Amino acid sequence: NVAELKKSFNRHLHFTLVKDRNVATTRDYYFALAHTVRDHLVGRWIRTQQHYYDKCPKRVYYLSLEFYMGRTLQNTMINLGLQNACDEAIYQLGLDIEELEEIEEDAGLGNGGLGRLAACFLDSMATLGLAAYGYGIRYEYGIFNQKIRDGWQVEEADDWLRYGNPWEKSRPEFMLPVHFYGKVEHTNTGTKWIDTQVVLALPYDTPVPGYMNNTVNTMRLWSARAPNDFDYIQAVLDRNLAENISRVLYPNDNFFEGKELRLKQEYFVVAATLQDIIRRFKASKFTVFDAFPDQVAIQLNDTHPALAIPELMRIFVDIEKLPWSKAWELTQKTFAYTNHTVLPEALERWPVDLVEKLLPRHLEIIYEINQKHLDRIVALFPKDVDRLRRMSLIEEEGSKRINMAHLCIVGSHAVNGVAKIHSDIVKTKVFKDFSELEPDKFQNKTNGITPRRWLLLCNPGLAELIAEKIGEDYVKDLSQLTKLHSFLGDDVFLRELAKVKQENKLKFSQFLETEYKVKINPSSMFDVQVKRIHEYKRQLLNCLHVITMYNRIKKDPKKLFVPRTVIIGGKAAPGYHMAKMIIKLITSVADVVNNDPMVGSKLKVIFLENYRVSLAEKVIPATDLSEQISTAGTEASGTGNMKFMLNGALTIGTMDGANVEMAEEAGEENLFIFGMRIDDVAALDKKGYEAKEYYEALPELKLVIDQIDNGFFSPKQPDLFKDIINMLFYHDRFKVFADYEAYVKCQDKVSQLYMNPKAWNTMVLKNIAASGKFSSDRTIKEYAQNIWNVEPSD
Amino acid sequence: NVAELKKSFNRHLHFTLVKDRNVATTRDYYFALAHTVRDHLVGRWIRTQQHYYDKCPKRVYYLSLEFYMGRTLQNTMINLGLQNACDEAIYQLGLDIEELEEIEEDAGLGNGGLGRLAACFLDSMATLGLAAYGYGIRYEYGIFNQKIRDGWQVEEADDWLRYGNPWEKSRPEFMLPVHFYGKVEHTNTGTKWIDTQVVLALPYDTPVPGYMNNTVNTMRLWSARAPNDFDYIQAVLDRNLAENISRVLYPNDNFFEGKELRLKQEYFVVAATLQDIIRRFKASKFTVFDAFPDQVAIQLNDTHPALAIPELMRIFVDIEKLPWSKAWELTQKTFAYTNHTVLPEALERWPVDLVEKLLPRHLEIIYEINQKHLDRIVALFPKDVDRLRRMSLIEEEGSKRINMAHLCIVGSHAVNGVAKIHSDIVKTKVFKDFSELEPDKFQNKTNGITPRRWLLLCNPGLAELIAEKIGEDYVKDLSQLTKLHSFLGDDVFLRELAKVKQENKLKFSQFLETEYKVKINPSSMFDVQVKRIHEYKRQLLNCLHVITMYNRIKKDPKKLFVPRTVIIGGKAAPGYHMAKMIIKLITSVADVVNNDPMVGSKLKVIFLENYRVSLAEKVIPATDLSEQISTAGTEASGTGNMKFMLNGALTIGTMDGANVEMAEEAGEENLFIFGMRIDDVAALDKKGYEAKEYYEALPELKLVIDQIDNGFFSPKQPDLFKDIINMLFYHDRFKVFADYEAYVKCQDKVSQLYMNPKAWNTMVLKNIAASGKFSSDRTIKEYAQNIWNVEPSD
Numbered sequence A, B: 001n002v003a004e005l006k007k008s009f010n011r012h013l014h015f016t017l018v019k020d021r022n023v024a025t026t027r028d029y030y031f032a033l034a035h036t037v038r039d040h041l042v043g044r045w046i047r048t049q050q051h052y053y054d055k056c057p058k059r060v061y062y063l064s065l066e067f068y069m070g071r072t073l074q075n076t077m078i079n080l081g082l083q084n085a086c087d088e089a090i091y092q093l094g095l096d097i098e099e100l101e102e103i104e105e106d107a108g109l110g111n112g113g114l115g116r117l118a119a120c121f122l123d124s125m126a127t128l129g130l131a132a133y134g135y136g137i138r139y140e141y142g143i144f145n146q147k148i149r150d151g152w153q154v155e156e157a158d159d160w161l162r163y164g165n166p167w168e169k170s171r172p173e174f175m176l177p178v179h180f181y182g183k184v185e186h187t188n189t190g191t192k193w194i195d196t197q198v199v200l201a202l203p204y205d206t207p208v209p210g211y212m213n214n215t216v217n218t219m220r221l222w223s224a225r226a227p228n229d230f231d232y233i234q235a236v237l238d239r240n241l242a243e244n245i246s247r248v249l250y251p252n253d254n255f256f257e258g259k260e261l262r263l264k265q266e267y268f269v270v271a272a273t274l275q276d277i278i279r280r281f282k283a284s285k286f287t288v289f290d291a292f293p294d295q296v297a298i299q300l301n302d303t304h305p306a307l308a309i310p311e312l313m314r315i316f317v318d319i320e321k322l323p324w325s326k327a328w329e330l331t332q333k334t335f336a337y338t339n340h341t342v343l344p345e346a347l348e349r350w351p352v353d354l355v356e357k358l359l360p361r362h363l364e365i366i367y368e369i370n371q372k373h374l375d376r377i378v379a380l381f382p383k384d385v386d387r388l389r390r391m392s393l394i395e396e397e398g399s400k401r402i403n404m405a406h407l408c409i410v411g412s413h414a415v416n417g418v419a420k421i422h423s424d425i426v427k428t429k430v431f432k433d434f435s436e437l438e439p440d441k442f443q444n445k446t447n448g449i450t451p452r453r454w455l456l457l458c459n460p461g462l463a464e465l466i467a468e469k470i471g472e473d474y475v476k477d478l479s480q481l482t483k484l485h486s487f488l489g490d491d492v493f494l495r496e497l498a499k500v501k502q503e504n505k506l507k508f509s510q511f512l513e514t515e516y517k518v519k520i521n522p523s524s525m526f527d528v529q530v531k532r533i534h535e536y537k538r539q540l541l542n543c544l545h546v547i548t549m550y551n552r553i554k555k556d557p558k559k560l561f562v563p564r565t566v567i568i569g570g571k572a573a574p575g576y577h578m579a580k581m582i583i584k585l586i587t588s589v590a591d592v593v594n595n596d597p598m599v600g601s602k603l604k605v606i607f608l609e610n611y612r613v614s615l616a617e618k619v620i621p622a623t624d625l626s627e628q629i630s631t632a633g634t635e636a637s638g639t640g641n642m643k644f645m646l647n648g649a650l651t652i653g654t655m656d657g658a659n660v661e662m663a664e665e666a667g668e669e670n671l672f673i674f675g676m677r678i679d680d681v682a683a684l685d686k687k688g689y690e691a692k693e694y695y696e697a698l699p700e701l702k703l704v705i706d707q708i709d710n711g712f713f714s715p716k717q718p719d720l721f722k723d724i725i726n727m728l729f730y731h732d733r734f735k736v737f738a739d740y741e742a743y744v745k746c747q748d749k750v751s752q753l754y755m756n757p758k759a760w761n762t763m764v765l766k767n768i769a770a771s772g773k774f775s776s777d778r779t780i781k782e783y784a785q786n787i788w789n790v791e792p793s794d
Ligand SMILES: O=C(O)c1ccccc1-n1cc(C(=O)O)c(=O)c2cc(Nc3c(F)cc(F)cc3Cl)c(Cl)cc21
Pocket: A045, A046, A049, A050, A053, A168, A169, A170, A171, A205, A206, A280, A283, B017, B018, B019, B020, B023
């Protein structure tokens, strides 16, 4: 009822914001509607927790250093079935719903795909009706806001909580202490962890509404506070050091920075979370611990929470006094581990000395785990000397580091990767030693995305067209998109789909031009690469094509060119030198291409600043061509690739990650595949990569490189890109030049299909009808039936 | 309405706390009641801000580094008339309102009297309907929580906002930048203060409801926030540096510590406050600035906000482009200054170096003020060199210092002390060079306390009793308590009054038995000294009388002794060593006394821990004898003295501060006055105070002293009180031994009168009936009429 939403909105503006219509700001109006929406899920939120208590289904705990949630307001209105009615209430009050919605800050508590997978997973688990909780840290500052100054990336603190967060509720009654430093005592009564510093963990709960059912799950994020208690003023100011633990998200994507503060974040979330889970188990209706793993499944989102394993043992053994053997069995039955990482600089390998200083009892537990584990490998392969050190959790040359991924393997009953190709590599290659010993342990769960945020919310244009032709059933069961196959005839439908795309591109062009000076050709193909800046992901390669395209327009100003707007966006980690140069390069190239009247409206280049969830929601539905061009074997899965496939873009990319599986589903000819498969990378490695050759052998490449190296793109600073040229020529692990030729030929095929609207849109249709498999709902049912041993319900 | 308050409470329990009665905590209930109650003042809060805008009465700004508010819930129910309905609603829900009340953290954002005076003032200004605002700093941590471990004060961080504060509203639209450091350029377009560091000031509003009227005024308290255009992680942590400005209250009662962080707090609150005042003035119905002092009054609460004077000049000159002489005239008419300070070490004298670095432009402006000021003095007194040096704002010795009082004197049109005798000495001695020049500048405004918090709230028994006899008009005109005079021969009324005191003692005794393990004689005289711990206040002297009573009992366990519970309480500044030693002495004496089996229920001693506003509210209504015993000439006014008078305590004290006026009103013979007066103290200083002569001349003292010094009260460390002894004999500025005799005799008289209930209560009744003068309503009327030129409305 619209009328009761208006009344609610007005009660909140008056009692909650203390405002009337003459002095209310847009923010006041935003908070008023958010409270009004939140009030509508309270009944289900309470009932849902009551239900789990009454029925005791086995509970799933998603443990993660990252939750890339984006904005809550719209997502909540849609999942509650309240968007139409709220829209209508706000309209009648004389307000602009878009404007209210833009005021909300992103909860940008993740870096990219790992964080965003956790968020799709919550949406899905709640939609499927599972008893799931996400546990993470309530960062005061999420991933930084990126601005571009003088074409370089500059970082601003992302102060997302400054004005308050109507979507969280503090849970003071569930505050817990966490322990750090101190020392081990071995005594008559057992092994004691003593003289520790204490930091308080205060949880805050955000609701996670299922799509059109009665379920609201909880995301509980922990915030660090100084104990209570304890130059007096200085001592009050130093309470800051304890709160520094949950201050800011580490902004590395696929890279391991072994800093102490980060190790503290990791212990912090793991110690608070395990205590809470044990408190809930004990208050439940369930050798008191025998039933623990039938009531509890904890999923380790990469190695970041790996410490959960020895922490659970610490609790079981030091506090609850269970025998080691019994505790170890319960531990293994409780945890499952998701590998996402692939790349050697991305692997967590903590210095034994750092751990000893910070968590000396956990070191002992880790050594002790490693002993049993190794004892059992000796017994099975009595004089395989080297198997012992390949399989040891400790890595011994020089420093001494704990290999956290081995810790997670021995402590879990399931290890999975995130796409067929990735899981296969993890299994037969990277942890070959481990899966021979127990093959049934390793599995695959191909990633997915939620079709709530990533179709209904971001693309109401397309959602409705689909609903006109096939019903609204697809929202709960995405495989029904295959029905859009029966419109392969329909030129009418094919014009309707191009029409949706068109509007999205117009909408997004309004945005683009208010922010970038640049003039957008509305009839150009929107060509888009948006994802974190990393060498493996090869924004560079895209950039080499952009220049290749420019060099072609110049030499033949008259020849036919299919116009492009080339969009490339993403954040670079602040300490990642090469990624920052790559950004400088793209913006330098943009400057040249954009102001050249020779090229004019044929081709425009935009660096998209501050790429983040709520921006992806704008740019994805406006995309014609999705760039997914990581070197074969580097992208564990990808999820951007799936977002685009579902939103009517075509894909150019390598046989890597979930691109393989998208090709399987749409038909390989309905995507633009190109480049080395993973065997060719293997072959090229073995024979040695000589970058110089492809540069000699290929006229179009050479020009591009000569321009970059010489100052074409930086006249005022002709040696600007020296470190790039340098890396491409002598140190490129990702073989950019090696894929240059197949990539440029592939793009030419793309450009000529686009000139044919009916054939372009025919392929787009086969992509959308094939995207069903990529719903996170499919992903979550798989984890449920094969890892967690739980059942979807309502 | 009862039924409706229950519905409201239940709605907030459900929609604001997300709870039901099964898992709600006491804190959930407190929060649900707080919000139900806040909702009742929201309409008048909006309306009274609208009213001020529409009618533009002259606005009063009370600018203070301290607001010692205590709890908000009960005070608010009372001033709104809802207390009984809420007691009834909460009771019918099966809860106990007093337990919900205990959940609330004091807003301890003050040290003592200066801070409590600001709070009582806000209550009075609301009740009188003046268009008044309080402006302060929203300290993240107030005055520390005092623990006593093993006889010693230990400090714990007062983390009052940990769980949230339902009484404040953040006001994003009024966020303001504040500037520090940088440098000055005198250009041809005016003076420019540039390369500054910026800290944002985000204001939070708390409501200040008048008693039973239509006014809710505002307390606006600023919070420090780092700006968002600024190793990445370290730079994000370093944002803590900016936010440290409002982290914690400096806890010195009556002592200047020249810390840089404190100077920053001072400028912080003054810069934000002045900007906010100027924006309001400019958005209102009124250069242009000629109407400023007719629309704005700013009261400076001590010299802490002295910077306001050059800052207002900076805005008028550098930013509004007014000429110096016009800006200076408006300034003098805008500010007035309250001086509360007596002791030399408490005078604010900032180093010029420090002010140059932090505030280079305020230094120039202050030098200019001094220059124009010293010229008028060369002119009136042509050959008076030393007078120039006396009246200078710059103290010129080794370290050059700014004398903030002199700055407040020349930038203000009125300067007041806070009691007759204090204002006198401020005028004729301390600032006689200034008052000779400007006699009408210097005024008296005798301090006052609000009878809402300090009678209706803390003592419902007495408040009801009085209302039953003379109606309820006294609450808004406390002079009406003189009507209680006509009940002096009324035996039943005298008995009723004692019964009220009796109840207060029982309720308070339960509190003492449950906190301290000490059996309380319910019929003992409650003899109470509660105030910040300071030598001038002479808690020491009290402690000498306690040991004296103990000895008289030891020497003579058969002699009749009028039984006492002696309560001493108060916090010591953290680096005030002597203060700390005095606490340890008191608790040491108590250990001996409370456990001596020869004493038993004759004499109990309690060190009352964590003395604060909401504990004042418990102990004052239960007091028989109030100790106000500072050395004559050291207490500017006192306000505790006033709280006991209104609540049915007799007073023993010196002719000091407001004790003098208490005696005028009540009749000297109705107080227990003793000891040297201000002239006696002069004479003994001139003679030279030799403490040796009293120790030898008075055998009862000599024993007390010997015992302290020989380890009688500290067996495991005979030497413990060495520092106290040394001070007493060679460095006692406050002449403890010299008032001992007179004070002990005076105690003996109190014991006599105590044995005669009918005589005791007759004297009580004359005190209560004379306490009308000490309403902060009276005080605020005088400031309104003689300083601010504004009128009480309704
Ligand atoms: O508390 C219990 O032990 C309990 C007992 C019986 C049935 C349910 C219970 N329960 C357990 C929780 C947990 O284990 O973490 C809850 O968080 C919980 C929360 C709520 N309410 C609520 C809340 F107070 C704030 C918020 F942000 C979101 C919610 Cl859902 C309620 Cl009525 C019961 C809860």
